[PDB]
């Protein structure tokens, strides 16, 4: 019948369909397997890499502890022995003396006649008695102790450095990439009432450069007379804040953030303690962070544009190379709590090599 | 009687004597005690001092290991779940497909009447079966893994210098202080036949400086034409050897030791692989050792006199700042497979600023050793 033949036709068709789907299914199941294996292979490689390094550190430390502990036991042993032997010998000396004293005292309570007869050699023996042993510190104790001090010194230096790099890396782990920092962009302007008197400003207060000696803003108390500096608006009490500055081919500058209450007097250094968290460009290919002492930074691709990121939650301030989309430097967490604001210096003219302005730029 | 009185006098005298001795004895006994306990206390203080620091470090390391392993576990866990869940689901899809295929294959071999009865439902279900789930990698795996890389990098940046410092301090245990090395003084002269042609030498072969280009020694195959160097005599096959060089206020130079068989061609780097163990002064307050990559050295009190110490047994070569009586650098654990000799460079003239000679200088405690130029 027509309907049976037709149904057989459709059965064949559907069989083909189903078989193609099944084949796709197998390929897919297999590929999932391949990807899983590939993932675990990656993780295992990483695992083994970390495992070697830790194993190596632990080995050296076990060695260090072993030897130090042996050194302690050794010196302890020596000093114990010398102490005991000396105490015993000098006590033998005093005992001998005590007996001779006893004898002479015993000669008293004798009659003259008895005395002359029984005097014996006591006087000679008294006259020739050894002087009790003088304590003299042996060199062996002194060197073993000095070795211990040296190893202690090594330990303090090495563990200090380790503690510091570890903390550095620990803090580095939550610093955002550039786009994350950029999410918190704010609009910053220059507060010209704070400026060093020879600074010159664009009409939009986004740009600042250093003028010559006869180019002077009107004097006022709010100016930083003694530092080539200018502050930015707004201030910050909280949250995450970001801005960007075009530095171009300048040879010198200062960028970062400061406490709003920094002293306007010039006898203070730029440092966290005085309320500054900045990066300074000294000259071409010389950058340093204003840590104490300052940390020199090697930046493979010099920045044409620098990003500044304040994060109040963790109390950290980070710097980004916008040009190369890379991290420059982050100041230690819990540096600050009170209000902050941006700070700028376009540096000195450097003969004419550094006359270009700094420019605050929108993201 | 007179004799009795005398006996009594001598008796009293000796009592006073013995009493002074006893008192001194007591004082010394107690002072000895003090000095000893004082040592025991010092030791113990050192002990507690170190023990606290190490405990802290161990703690920090335990924390890093946990930090890393938590990610390892997290990654392993996610890949595990995604993998099993996906496999199980697609396997269900494929099995459903297999079942429908089974049904159809059974129907196509049934009698016509039997075939016609239930066919519509099976065919509908065949037509409408979903395509088996396609594998798509979740971002989460990619992320957790990248995080794991970040953490391994964390562990390495945190630990590297520290592990290297521990290794170095270990290697330093067989390196004497300066007088220990000076103990092995030997007398070295310059082998002028090996010298870069514009180099100039003293009569006694202890001094070498760089002359101008028109000052040329007679040319020969044995000279270093492409490098401003000269080698020293004698060579060493063994033992511990020490010598000293006055560098004074020079701004550039090379000092150290090399394999006698170094290439006389100038296309090789100064490096262990090429048979060089040297320290180079680049300019004022910049020194580096020819490790690979170079180890840059900052020296607080610059040397006017530099000591070189080869220890062939343990394969080390050490460098000393004689002026400050301090250590500059050590190549440790080197593979020495043959004779070594001294090597020198007076640097370039640098605009008249580095024109002064290097002078091999004897150490005070050595006999004269005349005349050594008869062994060269």
Numbering used by the authors:
A (entry chain B): 413 to 775
B (entry chain A): 413 to 788
Q: What do the authors of the reporting publication say about this deposited model?
A:
Almost 50% of all TRIM proteins - including TRIM20 - carry a B30.2 domain immediately after the coiled-coil domain of the central TRIM motif. TRIM20 is considered to inhibit the inflammasome mediated maturation of pro-IL-1β8, but it can also potently induce the maturation of this cytokine.
TRIM20Δ413 crystallized in space group P21 with 6 chains in the asymmetric unit. In the crystal TRIM20Δ413 forms a clear dimer with a coat-hanger-like shape. Dimerization is achieved by the coiled-coil motifs (E414–N586) that form an elongated and slightly bend scaffold for the globular B30.2 domain (E589–G776). The B30.2 domain is connected to the scaffold domain by a flexible loop (V587-P588) that acts as a hinge. The subunits of the TRIM20Δ413 dimer arrange in an antiparallel fashion along helix α1 with a shared interface of more than 4700 Å2. Therefore, we refer to the conformation seen in the crystal structure of TRIM20Δ413 as the closed state.
